[PDB]
Design an enzyme around this catalytic site. Structure first.
Site, PDB file in Angstrom:
ATOM      1  CG  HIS A 116      31.779  54.759  35.948  1.00 30.39           C
ATOM      2  ND1 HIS A 116      31.849  54.807  37.279  1.00 30.39           N
ATOM      3  CD2 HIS A 116      32.665  53.793  35.501  1.00 30.39           C
ATOM      4  CE1 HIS A 116      32.706  53.878  37.635  1.00 30.39           C
ATOM      5  NE2 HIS A 116      33.190  53.276  36.582  1.00 30.39           N
ATOM      6  CG  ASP A 170      29.335  56.630  39.146  1.00 34.93           C
ATOM      7  OD1 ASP A 170      28.916  55.611  38.619  1.00 34.93           O
ATOM      8  OD2 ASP A 170      30.493  56.988  38.965  1.00 34.93           O
ATOM      9  CB  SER A 179      35.393  51.594  38.046  1.00 41.81           C
ATOM     10  OG  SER A 179      35.964  51.158  36.806  1.00 41.81           O
TER      11      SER A 179
END
Ligand SMILES: C[C@@H]1CCN(C(=O)[C@H](CCCNC(N)=[NH2+])NS(=O)(=O)c2cccc3c2NC[C@H](C)C3)[C@@H](C(=O)O)C1
Lengths: 259, 36
Positions: free
Chosen positions: A43, A99, A205
Site C-alpha cells: 500500500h 500486501d 505502516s
C-alpha cells in the site's frame, strides 16, 4: 506508534525509512532483510483509490537512523532503489490482501553496528511463536495519536518508538471488523478489558512486527504493518501482513523464481 | 536474504552480540511462559 516509548539505540538495526525524494517526506517504514533488499507494505507504493503509484525515482530509503529529524552523519545510509516488486494478487480494492512489496537497493549496504538484517520465519518458528497472547515488537516513526491535519499534523516523534503487543485470536480479529479477513493477515493489540494500550498509526505502516525466538536468540519478522480502523481505538486491533505465509512469494522474486 | 537465519540475522550488534538485553524484552519472554 501510540502508547509506545523511545527506543534504545541499535534496537531494530533493520529499520528502514521510506521517504519521498522531492519534496522530502516520510511515507512508510520498511525493514532490511539483507544488504540488498527491503521488505515494506504494498500500500506504501501503490494505492490506486488515492492515485498513489510510486516508481523507483520518486523514492529513497534511509537506514541506520534513530532520530526522525536530523542527519546522523557517521551512521546513516541514504540509498536509491533499483527495482520494485509488488505482489500480483495484492488487493487494494477491498482489504489490502497480500500486501507486501520488496524493494531492490541500487547497491549493497555496508552493514554496521546500526544496520543489520532481520530473519524471515521458518516453518518451525511460525509454529512455535504464533500463538494468541504471545507479544511481538512494532517499531516506527509515525504519528503518536490519530489526527486529521492542520498545516502539519503535529504528532511526530523525535526518536524511534517501540511498543510490544500480543497476538490476537482469529475469531476476535474477525469479529472486530466488518472487513473480510484472509489468512494473509493477523491482528494484534490489547483487548478492552486488559487496559494496556498501543498500536501502529500512520507513517508506521510498512514496518516490522518482529518476535524474538528464545531458542536461538534471533529476531524474526513475522508481520508487516498493514491496516487499521484509525489508531488504538478500543475493541479494535491493528492488522499485519503475515510474512511467513507469503514466504512463497518472497523467495520467488529474490531468486527470480524462487516459488 | 535467507529464511531461518542469514548467520548473524536478528542478532543485533549492540544487544545479543554484546550479550546485553533491551529494556523491554522480558515483557515478551513473560508472554511466552504465559502460554505455549
Ligand atoms: C492506503 C493506506 C492503507 C492502510 N492505512 C490504514 O489502514 C489507516 C491507518 C491505520 C493506522 N493504524 C493501524 N495500523 N492500526 N486506517 S484507515 O484510515 O481506516 C484506511 C484508509 C484507507 C484505506 C484503508 C483504511 N483502513 C483499512 C482498510 C483495509 C484500508 C493507511 C496508512 O497510511 O497506514 C492508508
Amino acid at each position: 506508534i501510540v502508547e509506545g516509548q523511545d527506543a534504545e539505540v541499535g534496537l531494530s538495526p533493520w529499520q528502514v525509512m521510506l521517504f519521498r525524494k522531492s519534496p522530502q517526506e516520510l511515507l512508510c517504514g520498511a525493514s532490511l532483510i539483507s544488504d540488498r533488499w527491503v521488505l515494506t507494505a504494498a500500500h506504501c507504493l501503490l494505492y490506486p483509490p488515492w492515485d498513489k503509484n510510486f516508481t523507483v525515482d520518486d523514492l529513497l530509503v534511509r537506514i541506520g537512523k534513530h532520530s526522525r529529524t536530523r542527519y546522523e552523519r557517521k551512521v546513516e545510509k541514504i540509498s536509491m532503489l533499483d527495482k520494485i516488486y509488488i505482489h500480483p494478487r495484492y488487493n487494494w480494492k477491498e482489504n489490502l490482501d497480500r500486501d507486501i512489496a520488496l524493494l531492490k537497493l541500487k547497491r549493497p549496504i555496508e552493514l554496521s553496528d546500526y544496520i543489520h538484517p532481520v530473519c524471515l520465519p521458518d516453518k518451525q518458528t511460525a509454529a512455535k511463536l504464533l500463538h494468541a497472547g504471545f507479544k511481538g515488537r512494532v517499531t516506527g516513526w509515525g504519528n503518536r495519536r490519530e489526527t486529521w491535519t492542520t498545516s502539519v499534523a503535529e504528532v511526530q516523534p523525535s526518536v524511534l518508538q517501540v511498543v510490544n503487543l500480543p497476538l490476537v485470536e482469529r475469531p476476535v480479529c474477525k469479529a472486530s471488523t466488518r472487513i473480510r479477513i484472509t489468512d494473509n493477515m493477523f491482528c494484534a493489540g490489547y483487548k478492552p478489558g486488559e487496559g494496556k494500550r498501543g498500536d501502529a498509526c500512520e507513517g508506521d505502516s510498512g514496518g516490522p512486527f518482529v518476535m524474538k525466538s528464545p531458542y536461538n536468540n534471533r529476531w524474526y519478522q513475522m508481520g508487516i504493518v498493514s491496516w487499521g480502523e484509525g489508531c488504538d481505538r478500543d475493541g479494535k486491533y491493528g492488522f499485519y501482513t503475515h510474512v511467513f505465509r507469503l514466504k512463497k512469494w518472497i523467495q520467488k522474486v529474490i531468486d527470480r523464481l524462487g516459488s | 536474504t535467507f529464511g531461518a537465519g542469514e548467520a548473524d540475522c536478528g542478532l543485533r550488534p549492540l544487544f545479543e552480540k554484546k550479550q546485553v538485553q533491551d529494556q523491554t524484552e522480558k515483557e515478551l519472554f513473560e508472554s511466552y511462559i504465559e502460554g505455549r
